[PDB]
Amino acid sequence: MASMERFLSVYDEVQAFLLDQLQSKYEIDPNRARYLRIMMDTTCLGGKYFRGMTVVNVAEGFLAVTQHDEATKERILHDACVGGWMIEFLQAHYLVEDDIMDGSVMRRGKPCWYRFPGVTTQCAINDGIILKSWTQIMAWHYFADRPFLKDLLCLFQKVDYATAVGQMYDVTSMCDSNKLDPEVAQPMTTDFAEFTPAIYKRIVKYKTTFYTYLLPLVMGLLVSEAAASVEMNLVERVAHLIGEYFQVQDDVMDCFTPPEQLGKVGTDIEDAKCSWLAVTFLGKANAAQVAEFKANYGEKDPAKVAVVKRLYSKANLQADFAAYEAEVVREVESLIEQLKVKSPTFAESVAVVWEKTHKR
Amino acid sequence: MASMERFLSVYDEVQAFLLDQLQSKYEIDPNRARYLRIMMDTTCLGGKYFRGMTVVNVAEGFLAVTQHDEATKERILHDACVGGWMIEFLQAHYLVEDDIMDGSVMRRGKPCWYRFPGVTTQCAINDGIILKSWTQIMAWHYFADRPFLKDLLCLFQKVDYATAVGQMYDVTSMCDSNKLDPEVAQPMTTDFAEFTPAIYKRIVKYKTTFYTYLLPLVMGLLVSEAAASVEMNLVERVAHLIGEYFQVQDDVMDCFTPPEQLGKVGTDIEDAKCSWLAVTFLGKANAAQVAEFKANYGEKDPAKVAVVKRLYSKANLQADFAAYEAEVVREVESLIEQLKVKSPTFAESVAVVWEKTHKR
Ligand SMILES: CC[C@H]1CC[C@H](N2CCOCC2)CC1
Ligand SMILES: CC[C@H]1CC[C@H](N2CCOCC2)CC1
Ligand SMILES: [Zn+2]
Ligand SMILES: [Zn+2]
Numbered sequence: 001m002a003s004m005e006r007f008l009s010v011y012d013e014v015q016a017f018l019l020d021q022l023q024s025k026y027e028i029d030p031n032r033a034r035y036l037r038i039m040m041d042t043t044c045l046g047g048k049y050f051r052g053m054t055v056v057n058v059a060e061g062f063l064a065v066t067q068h069d070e071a072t073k074e075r076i077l078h079d080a081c082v083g084g085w086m087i088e089f090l091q092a093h094y095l096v097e098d099d100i101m102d103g104s105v106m107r108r109g110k111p112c113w114y115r116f117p118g119v120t121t122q123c124a125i126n127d128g129i130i131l132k133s134w135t136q137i138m139a140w141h142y143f144a145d146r147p148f149l150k151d152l153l154c155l156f157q158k159v160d161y162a163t164a165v166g167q168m169y170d171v172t173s174m175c176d177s178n179k180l181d182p183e184v185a186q187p188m189t190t191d192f193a194e195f196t197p198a199i200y201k202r203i204v205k206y207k208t209t210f211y212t213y214l215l216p217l218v219m220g221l222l223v224s225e226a227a228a229s230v231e232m233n234l235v236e237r238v239a240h241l242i243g244e245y246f247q248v249q250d251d252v253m254d255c256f257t258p259p260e261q262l263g264k265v266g267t268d269i270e271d272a273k274c275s276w277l278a279v280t281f282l283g284k285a286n287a288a289q290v291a292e293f294k295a296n297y298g299e300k301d302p303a304k305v306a307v308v309k310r311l312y313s314k315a316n317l318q319a320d321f322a323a324y325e326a327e328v329v330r331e332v333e334s335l336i337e338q339l340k341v342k343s344p345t346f347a348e349s350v351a352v353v354w355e356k357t358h359k360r
Numbered sequence: 361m362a363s364m365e366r367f368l369s370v371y372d373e374v375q376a377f378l379l380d381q382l383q384s385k386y387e388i389d390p391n392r393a394r395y396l397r398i399m400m401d402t403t404c405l406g407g408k409y410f411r412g413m414t415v416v417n418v419a420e421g422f423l424a425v426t427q428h429d430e431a432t433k434e435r436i437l438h439d440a441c442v443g444g445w446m447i448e449f450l451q452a453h454y455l456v457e458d459d460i461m462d463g464s465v466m467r468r469g470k471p472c473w474y475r476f477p478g479v480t481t482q483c484a485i486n487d488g489i490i491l492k493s494w495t496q497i498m499a500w501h502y503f504a505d506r507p508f509l510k511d512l513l514c515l516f517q518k519v520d521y522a523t524a525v526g527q528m529y530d531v532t533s534m535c536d537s538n539k540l541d542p543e544v545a546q547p548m549t550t551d552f553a554e555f556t557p558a559i560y561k562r563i564v565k566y567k568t569t570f571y572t573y574l575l576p577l578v579m580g581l582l583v584s585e586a587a588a589s590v591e592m593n594l595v596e597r598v599a600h601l602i603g604e605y606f607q608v609q610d611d612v613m614d615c616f617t618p619p620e621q622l623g624k625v626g627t628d629i630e631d632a633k634c635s636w637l638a639v640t641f642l643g644k645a646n647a648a649q650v651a652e653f654k655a656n657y658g659e660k661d662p663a664k665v666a667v668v669k670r671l672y673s674k675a676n677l678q679a680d681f682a683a684y685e686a687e688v689v690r691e692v693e694s695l696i697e698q699l700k701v702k703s704p705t706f707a708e709s710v711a712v713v714w715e716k717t718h719k720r
């Protein structure tokens with residue numbers, strides 16, 4: 001059975017489980033069940049399933065090099081699908097709540113869940129809570145007797161928390177740290193002193209890399225009972241690196257990829273986000289250019305946003321991107337090596353992850 | 361050591377742990393640590409700590425009848441405090457997100473967290489996520505080697521999910537079930553056919569009783585290693601009953617307790633909530649009164665809200681409350697009995713829970 005077909009089948013099975021348990025154990029009625037099935041489909045399906053599929057792909061790699069009964073291979077693949085769906089639903093939880101937080105209009109060329117006429121923010125916040133609770137219901141049901149249950153739950157729990165901290169770093173990235181104060185409305189930075197490479201790195205590492213790269217790779221190891229084929233410090237370092245790279249790309253596309261191809265109107269400029277472009281720009285600009293950046297950044301006025309766009313386009317940022325890109329290709333290859341020692345299999349999965357990221 | 365002093369001390373210890381781990385392991389900076397410490401204090405302190413204190417009180421009851429070393433008594437009390445704080449922080453998570461969902465202004469005579477000038481909804485949604493993640497960080501840290509770890513986590517997980525489902529039942533309680541549809545904006549019910557005792561009961565059971573009553577009692581048993589001193593079906597039935605009773609009181613006070621004494625302007629009438637008053641009113645009203653209720657309910661106009669208030673006050677609802685109150689006193693006493701068999705200790709704790717609820 002092809003891996004995608006398997007992964008999508010398991011969604012139908014998990015959905016049916018969740019909804020069936022709502023009726024048999026939570027006293028739900030058919031119309032509320034239907035609303036939650038619609039919610040589930042709309043918030044969880046539609047992407048490429050990169051994150052869930054990585055869990056499957058890692059597990060399929062160990063299956064080729066490890067002796068097992070047929071029934072065990074099937075169980076391991078089924079566990080990888082369920083775990084992959086836990087990461088997809090975790091993502092979904094975050095997408096729903098982030099879109100509410102940020103006033104987003106569209107994602108994947110379709111309205112944000114909260115903007116659906118019969119949803120509203122009042123329901124969408126809680127819909128998002130339910131999405132994350134589902135991930136735990138899946139874990140406890142499907143993995144109740146698995147030796148990896150504790151490690152999976154503890155790992156999931158740490159990644160979730162990192163992601164939340166990451167969101168906090170992100171939403172506060174345009175404030176002066178020393179000005180943060182629940183009692184006082186937060187002004188945007190005037191100096192941009194906190195738009196550094198290290199600070200950017202901290203945002204991206206927590207907000208994205210933990211859930212997008214670390215968790216799918218390690219989940220694959222956990223369901224394969226194969227955490228000993230790796231040096232965990234290496235899996236960390238490689239995932240952080242691939243993760244950062246991926247966010248840099250999204251940061252560049254927010255600005256420069258047409259809204260139709262992007263699936264949303266990018267607003268990082270008007271939101272004053274600490275993006276790769278703003279940081280990298282500020283790292284090379286002269287005093288006149290820094291002045292002009294400061295006069296136009298984080299402002300809804302399209303002229304001022306077009307001013308920021310002009311500075312970036314004129315600053316030869318492609319040269320900086322290319323150089324960052326060469327250094328990451330370099331470091332990632334070195335990490336794949338250092339992993340190839342213990343597991344050609346895992347190094348190969350990490351190689352494929354890297355390729356899908358690099359080639360998008 | 362008095363139990364409250366102990367419980368509050370453990371908060372300072374857990375806070376210090378959480379914040380220290382953010383700095384040593386999540387790369388946090390002092391001003392973001394301060395923002396989260398403020399967040400934590402403002403969202404988690406200020407109530408009576410009924411829910412967390414019940415965990416402690418249950419455990420103190422078993423300590424009086426069970427042989428243990430001093431060091432073990434201290435460990436059990438410390439575990440009960442931590443677990444009690446997990447329920448308090450779970451509550452906090454829900455209060456923060458609910459207040460955002462509902463457009464609330466005040467709770468406990470102070471502004472809702474999201475309304476604080478340097479918070480905003482963009483941050484408060486995620487602050488709420490962090491609050492719930494904290495409960496898991498506490499559990500994994502403090503209970504890492506405890507035999508009850510799995511049962512605690514699985515229980516916590518089910519209660520959380522029930523609470524979320526409960527919120528869904530609550531926010532949709534004024535819609536016709538057959539009209540729920542993410543694609544279509546939801547009109548308020550015109551027939552009130554779903555304002556029944558059974559339906560009300562389903563809302564309250566999921567939204568409130570699981571986290572307020574079931575979880576503190578069972579957590580106390582779990583940390584005491586004492587789940588065998590009880591028939592779990594009885595602990596369930598008694599908690600549902602005490603839980604319903606408590607919500608009926610809050611439903612009555614939303615309407616009839618002055619805003620200064622209540623700590624918020626009650627809006628159940630204008631929100632068209634399926635409250636004990638609306639259900640009980642509709643269960644005894646004549647055709648003329650039902651007409652008048654339908655013409656005035658779920659409307660911001662203070663005259664129409666004062667019209668609903670007049671109907672209730674004229675409908676002799678105190679007679680219905682008194683009768684409900686006698687039947688619950690009756691059934692709760694019967695349940696305490698049925699529990700007294702296996703554990704005078706646990707029956708006594710449940711007796712105290714009941715008294716604190718009944719006497720408020
Ligand atoms: C294309 C890169 C995107 C992927 C989605 C990322 N965040 C969405 C909301 O919170 C979770 C993570 C932001 C970067
Ligand atoms: C005095 C009774 C109150 C206690 C708080 C209840 N809910 C608040 C928001 O979600 C969690 C539960 C509503 C009833
Ligand atoms: Zn965001
Ligand atoms: Zn982006």
Ligand SMILES: [Zn+2]
Pocket residue numbers: 458459461462530
């Ligand atoms: Zn509410």
Ligand SMILES: [Zn+2]
Pocket residue numbers: 610611614
């Ligand atoms: Zn209320």
